[PDB]
Amino acid sequence: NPETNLLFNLNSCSKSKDLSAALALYDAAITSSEVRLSQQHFQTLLYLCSASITDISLQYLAIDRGFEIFDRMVSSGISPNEASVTSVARLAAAKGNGDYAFKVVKEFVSVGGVSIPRLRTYAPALLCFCEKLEAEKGYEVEEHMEAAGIALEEAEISALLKVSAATGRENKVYRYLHKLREYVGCVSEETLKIIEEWFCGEKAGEVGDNGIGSDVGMLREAVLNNGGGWHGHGWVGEGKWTVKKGNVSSTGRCLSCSEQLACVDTNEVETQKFVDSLVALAMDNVVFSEFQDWLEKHGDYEAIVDGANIGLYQQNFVDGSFSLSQLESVMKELYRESGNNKWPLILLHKRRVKTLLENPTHRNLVEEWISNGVLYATPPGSNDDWYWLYAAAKLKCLLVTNDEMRDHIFELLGSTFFQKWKERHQVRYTFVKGNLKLEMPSPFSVVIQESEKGSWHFPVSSSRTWMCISRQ
Ligand SMILES: [Zn+2]
């Protein structure tokens, strides 16, 4: 078949990205048999056109050809492909005509049958509008983006931030800086420069004062309610900005302004969704239903320990197990750290618990824990238990485990939230020819933080570098 030979040649070109040769085949194809071109043909062509954009020696023709080529099999009546609509959008946005990029996507999301509207489609439309400083246009595409709707990755927000800065929109820069906090922690270098230029901007300094102006009392109460990080109400204080780029202390005190960063507080809606996720995989039982009911009755525990992890650490699979000596130690250190009120729950398998019961030495002590409620026996058939993970997350309390748990089963669930929660809650231990030295979750967040006085702090993507923002 002549056409199938053509698809081989088109794909052969796309491999080596020779769009000029692909163009000659395309021009020849319209003349040749006459051929009817399958949708794959200029799928390949449009895909190659955008691939060409980044290159210079081929870009200019791709712009000229891309629109007409696109319109050629659009004529066939196939609702354009999600990928293809991104391609023409890139071509448009690449050289001036951002508005075509916007308009084709809007017409696209209208279909909805197999629209599958991806952010990357919306992207070139917004970026081009941003570079041309069309602010209201950019806000409008964002509004549609939220509506469909994929939330914004960093690149899109930073570009949106840049425009509000250039157009001197005070309130919009405030919103988008908060938008950045919510969806990014440590920021890129490119964005960092954008943030820096705004605060040094005379517009920001002069007008920045807003009233409000008061009061720190309401602010500290409002900053607390939203976690450590931020208060919603607006701008604070009067005068011009002072910008400092500095490291931070072990205590998390910013060296420049002598204020320490608040602890990261994980998002509530995120907490429940993590809980719901693990719980769902659990029922596929009544034993776990007992556990849910059980914990609520016995609440609440300030810390929780991974029983298995402690005991096998650090002796070899001789079996060399099982060190209740090491388990008993963590209980001892934690109580004084926790103080005189609460004891840490330990989750161990019945197998481990029964063998411990069998030992005459340990039996009185372990039973004391079980009767008190300081020990719980995970039933057979399960698992690398979420029993403590659930309990730690449900109580939003501490977790004691040496598991990095960087495994496929864990990592599929493991996200951006997971690393936040781990730094937030995980405790680590080391044992050498003595007793435990306890590593703790960091007292301060590594994330964008907002203060009632001023203040804006930005980490950068450990001798980490930060940005400090101070008013007067
Ligand atoms: Zn500071």
DSSP-assigned states of every residue in 147-174: HH-PPPPHHHHHHHHHHHHHTT-HHHHH
* Residue 385 is assigned to a ligand binding site: yes
- The shares of helix, strand and coil residues in the chain, as percent rounded to the nearest 5, are 55, 10, 35
What are φ and ψ of residue 398, in 5° steps?
-80, 155
- The amino acid at 92: A
The answer to whether the beta carbons of residues 138 and 163 sit under 8 Å apart is yes
Instruction: Give me the residues paired with residue 156 across strands.
Output: none
* Residue 209 is assigned to a ligand binding site: no
The answer to whether the beta carbons of residues 177 and 199 sit under 8 Å apart is no
* Residue 468 is assigned to a ligand binding site: yes
Residue 42: closest CA among 83, 2, 5, 1: 83
Give Cβ neighbours of residue 137 (< 8 Å, ≥ 6 apart). Answer: 98, 99, 102, 129
Instruction: Give me the residues paired with residue 306 across strands.
Output: 347
Gap from CA of 259 to ligand 1 centroid (Å): 6
Residue with tokens 């659009």: 74
Torsion of CA 444, 446, 447, 448, to 10 degrees: 70
Gap from CA of 260 to ligand 1 centroid (Å): 8
- Cα 380 to Cα 197, 215, 295, 305: the distances in Å are 60, 57, 19, 19
The answer to whether the beta carbons of residues 161 and 456 sit under 8 Å apart is no
Gap from CA of 256 to ligand 1 centroid (Å): 5
Gap from CA of 455 to ligand 1 centroid (Å): 7
Gap from CA of 432 to ligand 1 centroid (Å): 38
Gap from CA of 252 to ligand 1 centroid (Å): 10
Domains of the chain (ranges; CATH) run 1-265+441-472 (1.25.40.10), 266-440 (3.40.50.11980)
Residue with tokens 């991974």: 306
* Residue 306 is assigned to a ligand binding site: yes
The answer to whether the beta carbons of residues 460 and 192 sit under 8 Å apart is yes
* Residue 403 is assigned to a ligand binding site: yes
Gap from CA of 48 to ligand 1 centroid (Å): 48
* Helices within 95-240 (DSSP H only): 98-111, 119-131, 135-148, 154-166, 170-183, 189-199, 202-207, 216-225
Sign (positive/negative) of CA torsion 360, 361, 367, 370?
A: negative
Q: What is the resolution of this structure in A?
A: 3.0
The answer to whether the beta carbons of residues 117 and 82 sit under 8 Å apart is yes
Work out the burial of residue 78: count CB atoms within 10 Å of its CB; fewer than 13 is exposed, 13-18 middle, 19 or more buried.
exposed
Classify strands 398-400 and 303-306 as parallel, antiparallel or unpaired.
Answer: parallel
Supply the DSSP string of 267-322, one letter for each residue: -HHHHHHHHHHHHHHHH--HHHHHHHHHHHHH---SEEEEHHHHHHSSS-SSS---
Sign (positive/negative) of CA torsion 360, 365, 370, 376?
A: negative
Gap from CA of 227 to ligand 1 centroid (Å): 19
Residue with tokens 């992890």: 309
d(CA 304, CA 301): 7
Work out the burial of residue 275: count CB atoms within 10 Å of its CB; fewer than 13 is exposed, 13-18 middle, 19 or more buried.
middle
d(CA 452, CA 460): 22
Structure determined by: X-ray
- Cα 8 to Cα 19, 75, 247: the distances in Å are 14, 23, 56
- Using alpha carbons only, give the angle 282, 285, 287 rounded to the nearest 5 degrees: 115
Gap from CA of 271 to ligand 1 centroid (Å): 29
- Cα 231 to Cα 210, 353, 423: the distances in Å are 15, 48, 23
Gap from CA of 5 to ligand 1 centroid (Å): 64
Gap from CA of 448 to ligand 1 centroid (Å): 12
Q: How far is CA 355 from the centre of its chain?
A: 43
What angle, 0 to 180 degrees and rounded to 10, lies between the N-to-C axes of helices 2-16 and 39-54? 10
- The amino acid at 216: V
* Residue 13 is assigned to a ligand binding site: no
- The amino acid at 365: L
Gap from CA of 196 to ligand 1 centroid (Å): 14
If DSSP codes are grouped into helix, strand and coil, which group holds residue 194? helix
Gap from CA of 268 to ligand 1 centroid (Å): 27
d(CA 237, CA 233): 13
What are φ and ψ of residue 455, in 5° steps?
-130, 145
Count Cβ neighbours within 10 Å for each residue of 313-329 and write b for 16 or more, e otherwise.
beeeeeeeebbbebbeb
Gap from CA of 310 to ligand 1 centroid (Å): 39
* Residue 384 is assigned to a ligand binding site: yes
**Cβ atoms within 10 Å, residue 339:** 9
If DSSP codes are grouped into helix, strand and coil, which group holds residue 129? helix
